[PDB]
């Protein structure tokens, strides 16, 4: 009766950062030793929680957010951060309580030609609220003239494609990111350790 962490981390494919997948985890006993004893992750930054102490307490719900970004944008997955990813694709609250986990995936997400399947939002009139998911494909209106759904002058497609190629530098290489969010509301606790 263990929680399905492997379905998220070890997934064959990952979603684009703008359409970041979220897996609600509840009513299961979670063993996190497979995570903090691992050696594959490049970054593992925990805010407000201690991964070693993960197999000791209880929570109401745990969220696993999956997406792919660049190496230069892994820094943007952190509370109080600013950037294209943190403002328009995936935002963490300042009071974030959880862990952000990333690892290099230049072998799974980089093709000889540009993968061009992972996308991110390039234009947005306002920043994203924390844990907000915007998957709109509406033509961005950069001027006062309406776009009517056709790209052109002052009318840009809000999404851009990551050019993941194996010959690029480490910063340009894709990184698969799984964000662990721990929710403890005044409700029966369903997620616990051993």
């Amino acid at each position, epitope marked *: 009766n263990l929680c399905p962490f492997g379905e998220v981390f070890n997934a064959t494919r990952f979603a684009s950062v703008y359409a970041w997948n979220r897996k609600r985890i509840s009513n299961c006993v979670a063993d996190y030793s497979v995570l903090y004893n691992s050696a594959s992750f490049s970054t593992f930054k925990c805010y407000g929680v201690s991964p070693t102490k993960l197999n000791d307490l209880c929570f109401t719900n745990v969220y696993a957010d999956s997406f792919v970004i660049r190496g230069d944008e892994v820094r943007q997955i952190a509370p109080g951060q600013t950037g294209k990813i943190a403002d328009y694709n995936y935002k963490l609250p300042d009071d974030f309580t959880g862990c952000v986990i990333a690892w290099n995936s230049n072998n799974l997400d980089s093709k000889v030609g540009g993968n061009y399947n992972y996308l991110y939002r390039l*234009f947005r009139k306002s920043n994203l609220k924390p844990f907000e998911r915007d998957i709109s494909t509406e033509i961005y209106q*950069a001027g006062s003239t309406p776009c009517n759904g056709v790209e052109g002058f002052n009318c840009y497609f809000p999404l851009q494609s990551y050019g993941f190629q194996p010959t690029n*530098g480490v910063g340009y290489q894709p990184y698969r990111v799984v964000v662990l969010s721990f929710e403890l509301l005044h409700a029966p606790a369903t997620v616990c350790g051993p």
Partner: antibody
Amino acid sequence: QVQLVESGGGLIQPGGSLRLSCAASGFTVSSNYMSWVRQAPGKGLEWVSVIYSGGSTFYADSVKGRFTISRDNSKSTLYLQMNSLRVEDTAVYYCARDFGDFYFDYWGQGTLVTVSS
Amino acid sequence: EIVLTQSPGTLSLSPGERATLSCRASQSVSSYLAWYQQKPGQAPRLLIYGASSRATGIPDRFSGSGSGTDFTLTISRLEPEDFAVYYCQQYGSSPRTFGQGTKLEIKR
């Protein structure tokens, strides 16, 4: 049509403040990336600051803590406060319309900031 | 900090020839390169974006190339007004940086 007209350049003593304005026509400033690019007399182009469509601001290391980029949508003008200026900052500052923090598809005529005692 | 080293520093070609300009890179930037033309007394004008795409209003005689570190700007059918300082800009990693420039003269 797109217009970018600048103002505010002139002579300023080292340490003195100066504010550069850049009125824009042809697009909404609030919905676009905009950047300031300065070119030293006889030297190349250098990116200074950028303001995102969502309001986020980023600055170069040589101008952090001294320069500030802001916009006034009610006046369709992009501003650049400079505060603690230096003689090295003397350059022709250009107003550029940024396309997603990548490249500048439209440029202003540029204004000259001279810092000397 | 990534440095773009253009070459040659200057050139002198007669009208109607083909001008080739090289832009080197400290690190790979993929196809995230742009080209600008700055006539004397004027602001830079966008010429090439994405290292291959041509900006609106630009004649077909301009063309971009290069993949990750070595980039080439080729201008054919040279006209007396097509000559200025040409800059290359990368936008692969922050901060964005330009090149020192490459002047172009109209020989006579």
